[PDB]
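Sample 1 of the test manifest.
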Amino acid sequence: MAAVCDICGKGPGFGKSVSHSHRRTSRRWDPNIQTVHAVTRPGGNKKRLNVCTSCIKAGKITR
Amino acid sequence: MKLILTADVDHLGSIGDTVEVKDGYGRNFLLPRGLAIVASRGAQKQA
RNA sequence: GGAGCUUGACUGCGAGACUUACAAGUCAAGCAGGGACGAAAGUCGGGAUUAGUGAUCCGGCACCCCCGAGUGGAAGGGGUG
RNA sequence: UCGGUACGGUUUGUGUAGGAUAGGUGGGAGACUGUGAAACCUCGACGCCAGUUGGGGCGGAGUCGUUGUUGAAAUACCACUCUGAUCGUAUUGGGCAUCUAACCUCGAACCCUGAAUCGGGUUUAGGGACAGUGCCUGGCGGGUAGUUUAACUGGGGCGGU
RNA sequence: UACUAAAAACACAGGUCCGUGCGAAGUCGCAAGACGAUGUAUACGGACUGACGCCUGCCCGGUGCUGGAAGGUUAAGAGG
RNA sequence: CCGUACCCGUGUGUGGGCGCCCGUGACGAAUCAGCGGUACUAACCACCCAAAACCGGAUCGAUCACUCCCCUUCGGGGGUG
RNA sequence: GCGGAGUGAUCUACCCAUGGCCAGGGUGAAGCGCGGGUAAGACCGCGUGGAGGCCCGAACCCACUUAGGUUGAAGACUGAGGGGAUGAGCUGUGGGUAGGGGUGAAAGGCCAAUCAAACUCCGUGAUAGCUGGUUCUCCCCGAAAUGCAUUUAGGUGCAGC
RNA sequence: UAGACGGUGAGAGCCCGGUACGCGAAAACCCGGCACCUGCCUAGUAUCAAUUCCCGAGUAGCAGCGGGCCCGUGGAAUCCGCUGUGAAUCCGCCGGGACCACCCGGUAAGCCUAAAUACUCCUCGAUGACCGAUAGCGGAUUAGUACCGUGAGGGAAUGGU
RNA sequence: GGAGCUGUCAACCGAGCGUGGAUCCGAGGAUUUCCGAAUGGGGAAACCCAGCACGAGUGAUGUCGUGCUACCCGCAUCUGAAUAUAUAGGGUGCGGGAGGGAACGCGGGGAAGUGAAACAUCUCAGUACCCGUAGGAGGAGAAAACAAUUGUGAUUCCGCAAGUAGUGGCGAGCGAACGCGGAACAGGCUAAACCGCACGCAUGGGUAACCGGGUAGGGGUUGUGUGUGCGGGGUUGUGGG
């Protein structure tokens, strides 16, 4: 559930995890993608849409 | 979220009264039903 | 060994030597300040001498406006113990 | 429901004080009684039954006050005065419960499949603001990964340095 | 154990113990999704032992598992 | 290749047979009106409940009200009607 | 020997689907039938029938002892003797599992003659306090194996010559 | 204005093919002149007041975990990404190395933008104090052939009458 | 262009052509089996088997020849279920894509060996390698930048500053900018307040001051606001609209 935001192109970040000893390793910062249904008009079909939370705050907000 | 209430709701009040929504009640309750609208320029339409 | 008074168990320097691969160690008469002792002349820059300790980096404490990213300040840094 | 915080708010514990049950007190020591009273009683608090306090008949009109015997008041107008307790009140969270509305449902039915047990959707039934998923953080962690694990040494090792 | 060792090793039947109430646990996978299983506690997975017969004693102190959460300690966050 | 077989497909016709159009064989409904199931059910009837309203017996009390005798401190009781 | 990206399950390890083979002999279980007994049974003696991770023994498949070969006829063989040989079997065809991973009746073996982490390439001209080699001549001069320090004594640094 | 190489029976300015030098384009094509074609514009400049409005929104900034910037989290600027909270429209905002004040510079969160620059599989021309067949790329010769390897891939030698 | 050719490897034969301009060299054009992104479907590539249409052929099936039919994305457009709108989907038609390409570039990903005489931090390196994705060059770009009062006024690239400042188990080692001097130098277009349209949603469905401002009348009619999109206007820092 870290798929690229369907309506933005927001992908995951890649980078390092600085441990106590400064030892670097590889990690990923997936965006907080939640599952919502897609509605284009009142009473819509409710398809599906993997969307970022910033758009849940403003944009393709259905339910 | 600031909405203009178009139908009476015990939680918020009378038609066009006010809004004190906890960011989501309207997103998935009011707006599907059409009980309120986005307070963009409806504040101008109403007053 | 015993006793009186005392803190030089100081500050700022230290020519000149030993020793040693280097770092490092050791000794230093003597000078200036100021002062304890001493009637004075004089001694004292810790223990009768040789062991009782540990380089570097980083960091902390007090003090000296030393610098202060436009400027005035500040932070931080710098210097001495 | 509870917590915590604050507010319009008040109040509370016998060495010795003994007609001021006060660790402490005052913009100063009368509000008031006659700007419809204390008190005798009661008992709500208090209640170890001391008497503060009023839940309440009174009395229908002061026991009192720097009367002093505490520390000087008989905290009565006044400043919120270690403010237990506590009215409710601004806030806040927790916990709990309920509810359906996001969300989940390899739970059912129908449909674009007359070629489908995948998938996607409509309606319905049921879970439920949980869980899961992203961020941050603590913890367990030879399952996995990179290296170390000293030297002298009458060979090495043990021993000892 | 081809290519030095076939055994006193291994393995099965049987016997115990532990886990799982079902898109199960476990495993493979980052996830999706599969196996397990078109099965489900008289089944399935894991560990030890190894027919049958007689038997399987004591100790929970250490180290692990499991249950509890009086109390202590205990990060981020809130608050500050 | 000689001799003898077999499956699918196309056609040429040969004759018989079927139906197609016509026809014909067979099959074959129920509405309208009378009667029964009482199924629903006005009115009405059987069981029992509140049997509504109202009347009545009993019951005590730290209730109240009218009266008997005893007590008093003057504020309540007692057996009772 | 590490790493990255790739290649391979035609030998071999294991499994799924589909076939064949397992000569010929031998012992002779359950079940059945007969007869005895018995109330009914337990039970006994015969016959049919024909099961077995059963026996003997060919092909097939394994590879136990010994002789031989051993710059072999052969990069693992042969001769002569051995074990299993209707079962956990052997075998062909077609298919899957692929590397810090697979598979494995587990031996740490097998994965194209090599496996305590396979092969080719790339980074790569890697690295190594160790070994080994460094090509023609002449002339002068001419060492040390000693001290100090070392995650050091088979090296290096300063000093000495 | 021809002595550049080369060939020709042994070393060529005048033997040859050639060079210098000067000619040479039906058809296609790149650049380029012209025409058509296409397309913008019935002026917003000057002045003044600033009561009104705008000047890039889930963005910036802030806090958290990181990258990268001489800059390894250190007092850590600016820039970038992720997650929660979440500004303003000129009396604003950002920056000027934590940071505050003053001063100064500039107005982010929309887009396009030639030149200077990097490289030569490949096509003409030219050079070379580069080899001359165990060298040059491995390939002057049946060359990425034969051959080795199931495969990824490895990868030869042979010139002279 | 010009008198000899029938290529070469390896060249012996045979048979022809050539002043009517051969052979040969350059351009354009047609044809161009089969495979391969491979595209009608399938597939051990270079094989197999089909559908539609036009046409050839047979007494008639067979057979043949030429075109067409992959998938996806976008555009136009019809129908637009499940349920009513309606949508997903489906259907028709029109454009584009995939794959190759020696090197170079951009964005994203990301080791070890080695060094540090061990070694994790660090380095080797943001390299090797990989993915995406173009171009002829790309990328970047027209200041919310530098300096700190001489002030400059888009970007890029070379050389200095310099192996300095500084950063680092302050070890191995890594490594700037300001500014100066050169090559080349061009900067232009949108959003928004507003104005006017189309459409969408309420109210007034006759009170709207709307219909070009205004003068004087007129109708009392869709005035007003608000959502989507089009068109004007404006695009700048001594702030401009």
